[PDB]
A = this chain, B = another copy of it.
Amino acid sequence: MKIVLVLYDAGKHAADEEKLYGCTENKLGIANWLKDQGHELITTSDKEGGNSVLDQHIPDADIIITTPFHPAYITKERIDKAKKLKLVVVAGVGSDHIDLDYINQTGKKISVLEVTGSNVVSVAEHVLMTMLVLVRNFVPAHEQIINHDWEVAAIAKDAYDIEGKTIATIGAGRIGYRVLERLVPFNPKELLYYDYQALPKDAEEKVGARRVENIEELVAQADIVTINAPLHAGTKGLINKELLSKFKKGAWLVNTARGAICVAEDVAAALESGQLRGYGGDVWFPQPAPKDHPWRDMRNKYGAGNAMTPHYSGTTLDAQTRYAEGTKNILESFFTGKFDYRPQDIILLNGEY
C-alpha cells in the first residue's frame, strides 16, 4: 500500500536528535518497519498548493498520516480526489484539520484514528509549569540574571506561592483531571471545575474537587483559571471582555486547549489593565502566530505576566515516542485486517461515528 506521511521539516534539528520522530527526516521511526512489511512511504512537509507533493499522491494514497504540529488539511476536495483512501491517522491528538463531517456524509469506508492519551500528561505538565511560572513571577526573575541585574524587590513584589490559591479548570476531561491530580500536593485552598458532565464521584473525591455549575460563578472565585476543554460552539470566543470582567481582579489564566477559546485582543487588554496578573499557554489563534500577534508583546503593568510559548507541549520527545508507537499499533490493526483498534483511538470507523 501507499502511505503518505505529512510532518514538518526539522532541518538541522533532526540530526541533533534521533528521538525527534515527528519530522520528515526521521519519519516517525516507522520507515524501515513499513518497507519491511512491503509498503511504500511518501514523506513530505509540502502540503499547501494544488501542485503540492501531498496532492500529487492523494489520488492513490491508501493511508494518510498527519500531525497537529504541521497539519495536512484533509479537505472536502481532497477527500473527493482520494480514490483509494481507507485510513487517516493522527500521529498525535487533534483532528481539527480533518473534515470528519464530510467523510461521514460521503458514506466512504474511511476510518480515522488518533493516538488517544499520548498528549495528555505532557500538556498537563505544561499547565502546572505555566501556573508556577506565572504565579512565582519566574520570567522577569530569569531576565534579570541574564541581563546581569539583581534587584529582588522588583521580582518579589508580584511573586506568590500556588499554595492557598483557589484553582479552577474549565473542563475536567483527560487533561484537566490530570492537572487537578498534580495540583493536590501543592495544597491549594480549593480545586474547582466546570464541565458538561460530572467527574465520577470517586475521581472527584480523589482530588478534592468541587463542581461549579456555571462559568461566571467559577471564574469569579478563582485565583487561577486553566482551560482544558474542547473547542466547539459553547467555548468558541468564551474568554471575551465581558467574561474577563467577572474574573477575580489580578487572576492568572492558562490556556493549553485552543487559542480560539479566547478573544485575543480581549485577553491582552485584560492583562494590560490588571484584570489579569498573568496569561500563558502554548496555543494560539491564528496558529502559527503571526509576528504581530498581540499575545507576543502583551505584558502586565510591571512588564511581566507573559508565559507564552509556541505550540509544542504535546511534542516533547516522550510524547513523540508514544505517537510513533501508537501510530504503528493503529497501522498494524489495519494491515492485518483485524481492525482490533483501541476503542478510545477511534474517531470514525469506516466512516461512522
Q: Across the interface, do A310 and B145 meet the contact criterion of CB distance under 8 Å?
A: yes
**Chain B neighbourhood of A153, CB < 8 A:** 8-11, 13-14, 20, 23
Instruction: Flag whether A181 is at the interface (Cβ < 8 A).
Output: yes
Instruction: Flag whether A126 is at the interface (Cβ < 8 A).
Output: yes
Write out, one digit per residue, whether chain A residues 125-146 have a CB within 8 A of any chain B CB (1) or not (0). 1101100110010110110111
Residue of A14, A152, A153 most packed against chain B (CB within 10 A): A153
Q: Across the interface, do B125 and A320 meet the contact criterion of CB distance under 8 Å?
A: no
**Chain B neighbourhood of A282, CB < 8 A:** 141
Q: Across the interface, do B125 and A13 meet the contact criterion of CB distance under 8 Å?
A: no
Flag the segment in A92-100, A182-190, A232-240 that touches B: A182-190
Min CB distance, A27 to chain B, in Å?
14
Flag the segment in A53-61, A157-165, A257-265 that touches B: A157-165
Q: Across the interface, do A142 and B316 meet the contact criterion of CB distance under 8 Å?
A: no
Write out, one digit per residue, whether chain A residues 64-107 have a CB within 8 A of any chain B CB (1) or not (0). 00000100000000000000000000000000000000000000
Min CB distance, A178 to chain B, in Å?
8
Q: Which A residues from 287 to 345 make CB contacts under 8 A with B?
A: 288-289, 291-292, 295-297, 302, 306-313, 315-320
Min CB distance, A182 to chain B, in Å?
5
Bound CA span A183–B159, Å: 22
Q: Across the interface, do A129 and B121 meet the contact criterion of CB distance under 8 Å?
A: no
Q: Across the interface, do B133 and A16 meet the contact criterion of CB distance under 8 Å?
A: no
**Chain B neighbourhood of A158, CB < 8 A:** 17, 317
Q: Which A residues from 228 to 285 make CB contacts under 8 A with B?
A: 282
Instruction: Flag whether A150 is at the interface (Cβ < 8 A).
Output: yes
Min CB distance, A172 to chain B, in Å?
15
Contact for A155 among B139, B156, B309, CB less than 8 A:
B309
Bound CA span A226–B152, Å: 23
**Chain B neighbourhood of A154, CB < 8 A:** 13
Instruction: Flag whether A122 is at the interface (Cβ < 8 A).
Output: yes
Q: Across the interface, do B133 and A126 meet the contact criterion of CB distance under 8 Å?
A: no
Given contacts A23-B153, A125-B136, A125-B186, 10 further A-B pairs with CB under 8 A are A14-B157, A121-B187, A138-B309, A141-B312, A146-B296, A152-B310, A157-B317, A160-B317, A161-B319, A182-B185
Cβ-closest 4 pairs across A and B = A10-B153, A141-B309, A129-B132, A13-B153
* Chain A residues with a Cβ under 8 A of chain B: 8-11, 13-14, 16-17, 20, 22-23, 69, 121-122, 125-126, 128-129, 132-133, 136, 138-139, 141-142, 144-146, 148, 150-164, 181-182, 184-187, 282, 288-289, 291-292, 295-297, 302, 306-313, 315-320
18 A-B pairs with CB atoms under 8 Å apart are A13-B151, A14-B153, A17-B157, A122-B161, A125-B132, A125-B186, A128-B132, A129-B136, A136-B313, A145-B289, A146-B306, A150-B310, A152-B312, A152-B315, A159-B315, A160-B318, A181-B185, A184-B185
